[PDB]
């Protein structure tokens, strides 16, 4: 691969339930939240200098990878389970250790990463909306607010965590 | 490649360490404010590099203080929860995963135990950790890792060895 530099990183966990803060408390206004039920949590990090075709490859790969356990114990995709999807921006996955600190030099800048993040979210939403099984079961796609603290509670039957690099 | 570790910051975590057996309820461990270390060991991993691996993970600055600066889990100080997680070594192959480079049961189990033991020893040799009564807890190798996790931002990092 000649040292071809990575383009993104995604971490995938299975959940029974997730609750994610989408706005922090602000004075008299309480923090605001989104939840999902049984489903897939995708944590995403984008790197500088990636191909124009990265996002549809990521959507296709991640929604179709067979990581969700059926009632028989067989592994299917989130689209086939079917289940919810929660997307969490997680640029820290790009951090590389230097002494006792992390460096994030390969990470997309705030504007680039924000844009890629909104786009990724929207493509996932559409892909789920194109999927018959998902639509008919009423599954939902939820997502974290870019730039915020990802206050997350997660309930699992084994997160079954995988990492996929683009 | 020796190993992969995934690190997440928590306020609380609860991990099933024995499944329910008939009448016998599931058994569990917990930590409070702490670090969750998910670990995967590859085939051929050198046991003599495990102390350094422990050293790297317990001393990396990922835990937030009230002033917003970061310190290791030993300086925070907080708890440590170690979760076996060889799925982290999976490589995507179309719609499936391949785990070819992961240690087998015999080798994996042994590395895991040794790592756990070295983490315990490292915390017990840390003055600040001992003064505060922080605990190291660990999952059961090869069981289903039933986990509840409560975070103020998991702040998830990945470190390769």
Numbering used by the authors:
A (entry chain A): 3 to 168
B (entry chain B): 8 to 168
Paper text:
Here, we describe the identification and characterization of a unique DTD-like factor, named Animalia-specific tRNA deacylase (ATD). Present in kingdom Animalia and more specifically all across phylum Chordata, ATD proofreads a critical tRNA selection error made by AlaRS. An unprecedented switch from the chiral-selective “Gly-cisPro” dipeptide in DTD to “Gly-transPro” in ATD is the key to ATD’s gaining of L-chiral selectivity. This “gain of function” through relaxation of substrate chiral specificity underlies ATD’s unique capability of correcting the error in tRNA selection.
To gain insights into ATD’s function, we solved the crystal structure of MmATD at 1.86 Å resolution. We were able to solve the structure by molecular replacement using PfDTD as the search model, despite the fact that the two share < 30% sequence identity. Structural superposition of MmATD on PfDTD and NTD from Pyrococcus abyssi (PabNTD) showed an r.m.s.d. of 1.68 Å over 141 Cα atoms and 3.34 Å over 77 Cα atoms, respectively. As is the case with DTD and NTD, ATD too is a homodimeric protein. The crystal structure of ATD revealed that its characteristic motifs (–PQATL– and –TNGPYTH–) are present at the dimeric interface like the corresponding active site motifs of DTD (–SQFTL– and –NXGPVT–). Surprisingly, MmATD’s Gly-Pro motif occurs in trans conformation, unlike DTD’s Gly-Pro motif which always exists in cis conformation as observed in 107 protomers of 19 crystal structures from 5 different organisms. In contrast, the interaction of MmATD’s Arg151 side chain with the main chain of Gly-transPro motif from the dimeric counterpart pulls the motif’s backbone outwards, thus holding the motif rigidly in trans conformation. Comparative analysis of active sites of DTD and ATD further revealed that the inward flip of ATD’s carbonyl oxygens due to trans conformation of its Gly-Pro motif has created “additional” space in its active site when compared to DTD. Strikingly, when tested with L-Ala-tRNAAla, 500 nM MmATD displayed noticeable activity. Strikingly, biochemical assays with MmATD showed significantly higher selectivity for the non-cognate l-Ala-tRNAThr(G4•U69) as the enzyme acts on the substrate at just 1 nM compared to its activity on the cognate l-Thr-tRNAThr(G4•U69) at 50 nM.
